[PDB]
Design a protein around this ligand. Structure first.
Ligand SMILES: CCCCCCCCCCCCCCCCCC(=O)OC[C@H](COP(=O)([O-])OCC(O)COP(=O)([O-])OC[C@@H](COC(=O)CCCCCCCCCCCCCCCCC)OC(=O)CCCCCCCCCCCCCCCCC)OC(=O)CCCCCCCCCCCCCCCCC
Ligand SMILES: CCCCCCCCCCCCCCCCCC(=O)O[C@@H](COC(=O)CCCCCCCCCCCCCCC)COP(=O)(O)OCC[N+](C)(C)C
Ligand SMILES: CCCCCCCCCCCCCCCCCCCC(=O)O[C@H](COC(=O)CCCCCCCCCCCCCC)COP(=O)(O)OCCN
Ligand SMILES: NC(=O)C1=CN([C@@H]2O[C@H](COP(=O)(O)OP(=O)(O)OC[C@H]3O[C@@H](n4cnc5c(N)ncnc54)[C@H](OP(=O)(O)O)[C@@H]3O)[C@@H](O)[C@H]2O)C=CC1
Ligand SMILES: COC1=C(OC)C(=O)C(C/C=C(\C)CC/C=C(\C)CC/C=C(\C)CC/C=C(\C)CCC=C(C)C)=C(C)C1=O
Ligand code: SF4
Ligand code: SF4
Ligand code: SF4
Lengths: 363, 286, 157, 31, 216, 199, 383, 67
């Protein structure tokens, strides 16, 4: 149980054909973070079971991630049915929950996804007896006294999970950056493609964004260390930034020479977002609706979302988190700049380059 | 009533474009001793509609290195020009109707060149100039052919015009070589065989691509109607079908030219021939 | 509720009829198996009869047919062309070489299956498969497209 | 001009699994 | 440039009697006597051209490969105009483990010949690019597969293996499956090379009889 | 015809050569200059007014009105022979006992190493396999295993329509191969009643 | 002026080309190959001689049995094995059927690359007929593994020669209707005449063979100068042209199809009765009835299907007039049941090396014509 | 062993064993065509074209006078 999870059945040096001994069930495996977690587990020789609700075309990318027989795909998942949850975890000694929601729909509310399903999942996990680890994902700004509904339902579900499954680990990362993220992508869709970009108040609320590969490494580091069972970890990058600094960094990176943002009082932003929030129910959910066009985002922007003092973070897992503002994490937003990424004139350094290279590049 | 007449014109144009692209597949198959589309609907009669609906739910690829406005504008410009040219064929009474359609078809070059400028491909820029050079080179022979045609078009009051309702309703036997040159010029404008070497829509997907092909087939139908008006004694459904069958028949049986080969053909054969025929017809018309 | 769910199910029926009857694949004629794919497109079997048009660019392509062996030198190019196709897309692995390395499975230069680089929907077995066997695999891919229900899944989100 | 596509029984009249005469294949020399 | 179409009738013959007799019997002795310093060893064996004859194999030093090949191309009795291939064979038991092999064809007199050079891993062989134009790609492939360096080549670079491939695969001490393998990584979004792992390792079957006499 | 003309030359060096020198008149594959009026009219009716395009057009129009060679799969099939090498299968005697006796000859001859065999003795003393795998994604469908088998246990049957959706469905074990043989036994026996005259 | 060359990358999608242009005129062409290099020469060292035979079907996979032929002949020469008469006739007949298949594909793929689409669809139904001929004798439409050391694998089934005669009775009509679309057409001539000219000195200096060599005025056919099996008995002509043109190669290839039809007709009438396999039981496996009834046959069946025959120590190079030129195998034997070294010589490897000197002075739309007229397949190029 | 396969009851010599193989018919197959087998005079084509164009020009003159 302690460190018998990672040692007792480990066969091979740890590549694609090796065996790690982990059978894991990842809920929400076709999502943004879940795909990276499923890739992290399967590449080391673990069997990963992936139930999903969507069409098979949106889950086909998970089939590549592991050797023959080690990626198991279970379509038509209904999380209101306990039989599907029971079948999906029936051979697993690790359960990882990445199921979450950002907007409400006439079929699904925040309590159904953040409260009721994690409680029933923790109960059915404790019923089996062979599940040695339950990794539940919540947010850094989760709080029971939060005006935003999703943060409050997330904290309530964290309490229910720690109640029903006492050794379950609660993971609370900050904003996650990546190619398919929900943080820079919507901010770039707000800087471009709109007449103006509203900023709540002065934009001085602080955040701690983190990289998706560091969170994927954090899950494996949690599975290694037995002490982290039953704890709560906050995952945040090495830099604390305000939203105005994030907007300035995106405007400098995109090479946009016209600041289209406008600072607005919070009541004005809520008055803008109110007509498309009283009609969010009785509707099956519309494409290209931003998760920033809600009052819950406005309430989140009136507070800090950072790692608390004395909390367990990346350093207790042995991980030095990568920088988010520069390097490989900022390379996808550099592709959306005006004109294209491109190299340059490339002629100052081609002086003492050999003969065929300059003609090959037509310099 | 004008909006109603234009929409009632637009409906058979798009229906006919779908049936043209199906009929091209099936006639090309029958020349090659096969069947062509038969499964998709009874006798394959739903294949263009499922192609259109498949492209409708297809993902639009917007490259994040191009200029989005010109990239969107190029197939829209092509489609709009094809529809406007059809309106000029059927919902006009103008004195210089053939000149109007020649002016519209001279505008159709812009979609190719905007696609070449917008998309950041190395050989899209290379092929757009070749396609524009081909269309530009054969437009002059089309214009000189129109000059030869207009020397004999007079209405009842005695005024010379290019009005389509004043054209005679008998085939123009005196202008058979000019008719053949006109048909090969139509083949050159639509980038068909044997001039199909240049493609420019290599970066387009879904309904922008669909707009490109609807514009191409509608322009082919425009030029077919124009040739039937000028040389075949009128505009009719049978003549449209027969000329389309002839174009598919030529596409089945011939190979294509090199770039410099059709450039030499258009600048050393077709233009001097149309100009010499214009001088001869002007000598006759005195 | 019953009427709107019935309409949504019929929207899936029509969309699946369109997508399965208009598959435009992209040819990777790497090796031996490409000749049988040419024979599938020829007059005896007539892939164009089923609505299949071979397309040169990945932007207009609906599917990928890997017909031949994949080497270590060719794998990033295949991956790059796969990444340039738009959604929804499928991959058909054809013949033993693309399926699992085949006769070159223990070589220093060959990728043991195109599964290792791209995800695959339908596997056609043989060395080479016959053109008629490739027709069977493509009809099976059509059957996979028929069971999809996209707007019903969207309606219950 | 000889026509492609012969009609019925003018080509492959018998299937190879229904050979009309039994075959006696030599596998050794009499010497 | 020879074997021009000259007879307009059907020819029922191959070669003439005197030249075929000279090529099939006397060519080894002729080459040895005319240019003795070029030849270090000769084998007359089972005849590349046909199953019915015998044909020579000439061993030479790398210092005289180019003059010997020029002589074999341009001499009036040995007009070997076509170079069919250049390759190598690895003999790890020898002090010089490589044998570079050149096959030639004479369209003038329906003959063939084989020329060998023995070198180790660090002795360069002179290029034959100036003598025969096909020697370029074959020497590039021989360098790629065996690591034989051909001095004086215009652009000796690898032609067959992967772009970053170090190692010469046709050596006897190189493994059949190699050292690295290739897969796509979803995290790095790139096709990545990794150390080799096999789901089923290769089974080596040792069939060789302890009564067999032919093993050399 | 295969004749050449000065002007129809595809390149530039020969185009420059034919218009500045009369070396093309010595070559016998060239068409000669017309000598009188009627020959000039024949040459002009060749170059202008086409008539070489029209012969190909007449041939393709004749093909438009001709017969077609398409079969309507899967309602109509192609033509195969009893020697056809399709899906591998394991066979039984008419009693119901397996023919295979674990000799490991088919595993030795397999050039792809697509066969994996383990065996021990059965509880009645018989020599039988406990594992018989065929990796169908490694197989090359040569038929050498069918040739090496001395008891006709492994065959390649007449089935070619066995495409799957997962690759794990193409790693056949012993039970599935016996199920294939139990499915296809009568057809395999009919094929082998003819092919035993030759083998 | 000081005009630098404009370079171009031509296709990842398996030929990669790096061109240089001075406008519309090419100055250099550099093919980058190895995208189909699967290391078959290394893998043949780990196979027995029967095990490594189906590797050769997958080298020139348009022409399979001709690739098998040279490997089999190289083994037979070192083994000192004689092939019986009927097996030699069968080998010649199926070699000529193979040549007809290859030339059909090569000419129609070339004409499709130029732009003519119909001859492809017309010729592939004839290709389907010849694939049925392959399948009826070997059970495989393409990778037959039919030619073996000492003869062929199985006898001809009863009823094959009847159908081969029925196909050969109408094949000349098919070739005739093929030439009505291409031979006297001005667009095809303007694409092919005087494009990529090869003289005789350049052909021999660049190691050319096959129909390239005959279109430059060289009378060289390996089936007439160094004959193998029963090719010396066959009566046929060598077609000769003298420009070195794409057009002349197209005409030579059509005439070679006619001559292959002539050889096929001669083999259908002179097919003898007798053995199709060599009676040396220590090389050739026994019949299945003999194996189930005599002890020596079962021992030889067991040993030939596990260890295989031992080839005596030595070396040879043996070549065959493959439909793309000279295909040769250099076999090195140390004495074991496995080849010590097996070098494969392919004609398309030498033909593709010439693209730098053949495309000079041509335009971009003539590169595909040059590649099509060299008749290249990258399985045999990239071994 | 071969006598067990091809021999018949009462066979006296090993040279009497039957052989039934794929064979050409007696007299062989009939001969086939191998080589290639193959318009109007340009004066005739030009005469027909001139006749059609002359009729067209006459009709043009007549319709011009009527107009
Ligand atoms: C022959 C050719 C073919 C044409 C004929 C075909 C027939 C017609 C078919 C219709 C065309 C189909 C597709 C239409 C394109 C859709 C839009 C699109 O994709 O984005 C464009 C897009 C914008 O560029 P971008 O890629 O975003 O930015 C790249 C630049 O570097 C960025 O440049 P920039 O940032 O420097 O420019 C910014 C500019 C960007 O301009 C545009 O957005 C394009 C403008 C024209 C496009 C028109 C389309 C629809 C736009 C709305 C029209 C509303 C007008 C009013 C209508 C009533 C509504 C209430 O916006 C402005 O800020 C404009 C400033 C105004 C002038 C200021 C100077 C004076 C100051 C004095 C005091 C000020 C008061 O690119 C183009 O402009 C493509 C040009 C092709 C358009 C068609 C050409 C012909 C138009 C019709 C004929 C003209 C008749 C006149 C009638 C009315 C005028 C239109
Ligand atoms: C520039 C922006 C668009 C301006 C559009 C505009 O001016 O609308 C026109 C023209 O626009 C339209 O009417 C068409 C609207 C376009 C959208 C229709 C979609 C197809 C149905 C209004 O036409 P009416 O005054 O109603 O028509 C006058 C009478 N008569 C019919 C004889 C012409
Ligand atoms: C339905 C579609 C119909 C078209 C189907 C066929 C498409 C063919 C495309 C390729 C045509 C090739 C072509 O036009 O070649 C030219 C000759 O033909 C032409 O120029 C043909 C057009 C002109 C017809 C004949 C005009 C003169 C007739 C007599 C006039 C005088 C008497 C009556 C007043 C120049 O090729 P070239 O080899 O000649 O080039 C001389 C330098 N190389
Ligand atoms: N920066 C971030 O993104 C942060 C994320 N988190 C939390 O971590 C998790 C990451 O989710 P992320 O991947 O980031 O965003 P996603 O929205 O991509 O994750 C959504 C996943 O949950 C599934 N899902 C949602 N609702 C349901 C449902 N009712 N029934 C079944 N499956 C459902 C989706 O499946 P389908 O695709 O079919 O909807 C998808 O697989 C979430 O819990 C998120 O709140 C924490 C901090 C920040
Ligand atoms: C070899 O040549 C060919 C190609 O290569 C050049 C091709 O690419 C294609 C394929 C591409 C196609 C068919 C796209 C172009 C045509 C379209 C989009 C059809 C247009 C039809 C319309 C607008 C009418 C259909 C809509 C209706 C009926 C409205 C439905 C509404 C309701 C039910 C409410 C074909 C067929 C082809 O032959
Ligand atoms: S699977 Fe067989 S036929 Fe297909 S490419 Fe590979 S070797 Fe060739
Ligand atoms: S048919 Fe060939 S590849 Fe398949 S199991 Fe038998 S020997 Fe192996
Ligand atoms: S199938 Fe035949 S050859 Fe293979 S182990 Fe069984 S008995 Fe032996």
């Amino acid at each position: 149980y302690s460190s018998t999870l990672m040692t007792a059945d480990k066969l091979g040096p740890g590549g694609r054909s090796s065996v790690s001994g982990i059978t894991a069930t990842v809920f929400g495996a076709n999502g943004f973070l879940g795909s990276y977690i499923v890739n992290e587990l399967a590449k080391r020789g673990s069997q990963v079971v992936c139930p999903f609700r969507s069409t098979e075309n949106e889950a086909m990318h998970l089939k590549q991630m592991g050797d023959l027989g080690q990626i198991v795909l279970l379509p038509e998942l209904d999380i209101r049915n306990d039989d599907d949850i029971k079948r999906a975890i029936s051979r697993s000694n690790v359960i990882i929950n990445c199921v979450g929601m950002r907007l409400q729909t006439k079929n699904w509310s925040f309590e159904d996804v953040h409260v009721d399903f994690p409680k029933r999942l923790a109960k059915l996990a404790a019923e089996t007896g062979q599940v040695q680890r339950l990794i539940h994902f919540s947010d850094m700004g989760a709080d029971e006294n939060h005006k935003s509904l999703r943060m409050r339902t997330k904290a309530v579900g964290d309490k229910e999970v720690l109640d029903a499954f006492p050794d379950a680990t609660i993971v609370r990362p900050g904003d996650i950056v990546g190619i398919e993220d929900h943080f820079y992508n919507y901010l770039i869709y707000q800087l471009t493609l709109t007449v103006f970009a509203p900023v709540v108040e002065s934009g001085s609320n602080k955040i701690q964004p983190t990289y998706v590969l560091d969170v994927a490494d954090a899950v494996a580091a949690l599975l290694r260390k037995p002490d982290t069972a039953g704890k709560t970890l906050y995952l945040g990058g090495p830099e604390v930034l305000t939203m105005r600094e994030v907007y300035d960094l995106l405007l400098k990176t995109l090479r946009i020479y016209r600041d289209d943002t406008v600072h607005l009082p919070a009541w004005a932003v809520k008055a803008m977002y109110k007509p498309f929030d009283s009609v969010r129910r009785m509707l099956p959910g519309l494409p290209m609706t931003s998760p920033l066009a809600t009052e819950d985002y406005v309430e989140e922007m009136l507070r800090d979302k950072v790692v608390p003092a004395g909390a367990l973070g990346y350093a207790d897992l042995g991980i030095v988190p990568q920088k988010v503002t520069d390097g490989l994490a900022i390379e996808p937003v550099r592709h959306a700049r005006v004109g294209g990424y491109r190299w340059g004139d490339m002629s100052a350094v081609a002086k003492d380059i050999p003969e065929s290279v300059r003609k090959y590049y037509n310099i | 009533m004008i909006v109603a007449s234009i929409l009632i014109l637009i409906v058979p144009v798009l229906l006919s474009v779908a049936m043209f692209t199906l009929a091209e597949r099936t006639v090309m198959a029958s020349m090659q001793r096969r069947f062509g589309p038969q499964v998709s609907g009874i006798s394959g009669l739903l294949q263009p509609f499922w192609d259109g609906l498949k492209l409708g739910v297809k993902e639009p690829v917007l490259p994040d290195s191009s200029s989005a406005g010109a990239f969107a504008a190029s197939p829209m410009i092509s489609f709009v020009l094809s529809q406007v040219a059809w309106v000029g064929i059927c919902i006009s009474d103008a004195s210089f109707q053939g000149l109007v359609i020649m002016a519209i078809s001279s505008l159709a070059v812009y979609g190719v060149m905007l696609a070449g400028w917008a998309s950041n491909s190395k050989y899209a820029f290379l092929g757009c100039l070749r396609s524009v050079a081909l269309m530009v080179s054969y437009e002059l022979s089309l214009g000189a052919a129109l000059l030869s045609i207009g020397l004999f078009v007079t209405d009842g009051t005695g005024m010379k015009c290019l009005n389509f309702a004043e054209m005679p309703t008998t085939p123009q036997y005196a202008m058979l070589p000019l008719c053949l040159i006109f048909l090969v010029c139509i083949l050159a404008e639509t980038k068909r065989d044997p001039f199909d070497l240049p493609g420019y829509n290599v970066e387009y997907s879904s309904l922008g691509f669909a707009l490109f092909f609807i514009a191409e087939y509608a322009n082919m139908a425009v030029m077919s109607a124009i040739a039937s008006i000028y040389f075949l004694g009128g505009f009719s459904a049978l003549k449209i079908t027969a000329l389309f069958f002839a174009f598919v028949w030529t596409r089945g049986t011939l190979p294509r030219y090199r770039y410099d080969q059709f450039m030499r053909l258009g600048w050393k054969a077709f233009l001097p021939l149309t100009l010499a025929f214009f001088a001869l017809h002007a000598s006759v018309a005195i | 509720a019953k009427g709107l769910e019935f309409v949504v199910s019929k929207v899936d029926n029509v969309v699946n009829w369109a997508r399965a009857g208009s598959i435009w694949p992209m040819t990777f004629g790497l090796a031996c198996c490409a000749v049988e794919m040419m024979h599938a497109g020829a007059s005896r079997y007539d892939l164009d009869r089923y609505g299949i048009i071979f397309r040169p660019s990945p932007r207009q392509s609906d599917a990928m047919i890997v017909a031949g062996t994949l080497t270590n030198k060719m794998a990033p190019a295949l991956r790059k062309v796969y990444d340039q196709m738009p959604e929804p897309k499928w991959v058909v692995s054809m013949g033993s070489c693309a399926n699992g390395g085949g006769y070159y499975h223990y070589s220093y230069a060959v990728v043991r299956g195109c599964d290792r680089v791209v995800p695959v929907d339908v596997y056609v077995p043989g060395c080479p498969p016959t053109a008629e066997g490739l027709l069977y695999g493509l009809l099976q891919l059509q059957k996979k497209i028929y069971r999809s229900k996209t707007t019903q899944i969207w309606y219950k989100k | 001009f000889e026509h492609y596509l012969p009609m019925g029984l003018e080509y492959r009249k018998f299937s190879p699994g229904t050979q009309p005469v039994k075959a006696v294949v030599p596998h050794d020399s009499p010497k | 440039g020879y074997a021009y179409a000259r007879k307009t009738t059907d020819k029922d013959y191959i070669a003439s009697e005197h030249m075929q007799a000279f090529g099939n019997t006397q060519l080894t002795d002729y080459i040895i006597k005319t240019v003795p310093k070029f030849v270090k060893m000769a084998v007359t064996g089972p005849a590349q051209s046909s199953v019915l004859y015998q044909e020579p194999t000439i061993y030479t030093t790398p210092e005289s490969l180019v003059p010997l090949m020029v002589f074999l191309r341009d001499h009036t009795n040995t007009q070997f105009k076509c170079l069919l291939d250049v390759t190598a064979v690895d003999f790890p038991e020898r002090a010089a483990r490589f044998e570079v092999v050149y096959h030639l064809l004479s369209p003038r007199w329906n003959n063939r010949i084989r020329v060998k050079v023995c070198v180790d891993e660090v002795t360069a062989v002179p290029t034959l690019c100036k003598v025969f134009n096909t020697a370029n790609w074959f020497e590039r492939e021989t360098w790629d597969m065996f690591g034989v360096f051909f001095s004086g080549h215009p652009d000796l670079r690898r032609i067959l293996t992967d772009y970053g491939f170090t190692g010469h695969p046709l050596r006897k001490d190189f493994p059949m499956t190699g050292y690295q393998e290739v897969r796509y990584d979803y995290g790095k979004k790139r096709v990545v090379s990794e150390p080799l792992e096999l789901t089923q390792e290769f089974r080596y079957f040792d069939f060789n009889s302890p009564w067999e006499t032919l093993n050399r | 015809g295969t004749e050449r003309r000065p002007g129809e030359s595809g390149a530039w060096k020969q185009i420059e050569r034919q218009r500045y020198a009369s070396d093309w008149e010595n070559d016998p594959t060239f068409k000669r200059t017309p000598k009188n009026l009627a020959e000039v009219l024949d040459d002009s009716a060749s170059m202008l007014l086409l008539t070489d395009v029209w012969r190909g057009m007449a041939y393709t129009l004749g093909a438009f009105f001709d017969k077609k060679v398409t079969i309507m799969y899967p309602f109509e099939k192609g033509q195969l022979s009893p020697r056809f090498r399709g899906e591998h299968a394991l066979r039984r005697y008419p009693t119901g006992e397996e023919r295979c006796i674990a000799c490991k000859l088919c595993e030795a001859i397999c050039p792809a190493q697509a066969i994996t065999i383990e065996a021990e003795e059965r509880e009645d003393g018989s020599r039988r396999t406990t594992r018989y795998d065929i990796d169908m994604t490694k197989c090359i469908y040569c038929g050498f295993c069918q040739e090496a088998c001395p008891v006709d246990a492994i065959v390649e049957g007449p089935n070619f329509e066995f495409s799957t959706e997962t690759r794990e469905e193409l790693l056949y074990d012993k039970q599935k191969l016996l199920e294939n043989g139990d499915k296809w036994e009568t057809e395999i026996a009919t094929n082998l009643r003819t092919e035993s005259l030759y083998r | 002026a000081k005009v630098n060359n404009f370079t171009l990358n031509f296709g990842p999608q398996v030929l990669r080309l790096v061109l240089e242009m001075q406008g519309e005129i090419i100055m250099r062409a550099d093919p980058h190959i190895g995208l189909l290099h699967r290391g078959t020469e290394k893998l043949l060292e780990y196979k027995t001689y029967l095990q490594g035979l189906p590797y050769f079907d997958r080298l020139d996979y348009v022409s399979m049995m001709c690739m098998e032929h040279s490997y089999v002949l190289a083994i037979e020469q070192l083994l000192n094995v004689s092939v019986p008469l009927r097996g030699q006739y069968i080998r010649v007949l199926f070699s000529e059927i193979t040549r007809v298949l290859n030339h059909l594909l090569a000419i129609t793929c070339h004409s499709m690359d130029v732009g003519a689409l119909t001859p492809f669809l017309w010729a592939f139904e004839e290709r389907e007929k010849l694939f049925e001929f392959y399948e009826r004798v070997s059970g495989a439409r393409m990778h037959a593994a039919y030619f073996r050391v000492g003869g062929v694998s199985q006898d001809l089934p009863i009823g094959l020669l009847r159908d081969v005669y029925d196909w050969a009775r109408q094949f000349a009509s098919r070739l005739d209707e093929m030439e009505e679309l291409l031979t006297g057409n001005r667009i095809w001539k303007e694409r092919t005449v005087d494009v990529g000219t090869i003289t005789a000195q350049m052909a021999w200096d660049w190691g050319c063979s096959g129909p390239i060599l005959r279109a430059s005025g060289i009378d060289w056919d390996l089936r007439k100068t160094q004959p193998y099996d029963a090719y010396g008995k066959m009566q046929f002509n060598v077609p000769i042209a003298g420009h070195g043109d794409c057009y002349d190669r197209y005409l030579v290839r059509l005439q070679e199809m006619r001559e292959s039809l002539r050889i096929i007709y001669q083999c259908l009438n002179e097919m003898p009765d007798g053995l199709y396999k060599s009676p040396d039981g220590k090389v050739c496996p026994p019949s299945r009835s003999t194996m189930k009834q005599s002890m020596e046959a079962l021992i030889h069946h067991f040993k030939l299907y596990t260890e295989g025959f031992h080839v005596p120590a030595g070396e040879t190079y043996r070549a065959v007039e493959a439909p793309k030129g000279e295909f040769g195998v250099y076999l090195v034997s140390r004495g074991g049941n496995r080849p010590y070294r097996c070098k494969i010589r392919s004609p398309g490897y030498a033909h593709l090396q010439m693209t730098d000197v053949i495309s000079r002075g041509a335009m971009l739309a003539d590169v595909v014509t040059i590649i099509g007229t060299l008749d290249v397949v990258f399985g045999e190029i990239d071994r | 062993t071969e006598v067990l396969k091809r021999g018949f009851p009462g066979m006296k010599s090993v040279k009497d064993m039957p052989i039934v193989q794929d064979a050409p018919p007696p007299g062989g197959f009939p001969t086939i065509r191998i080589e290639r087998r193959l318009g109007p005079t340009g004066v005739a084509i030009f005469a027909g074209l001139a006749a059609i164009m002359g009729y067209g020009f006459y009709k043009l003159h007549e319709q011009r006078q009527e107009k």
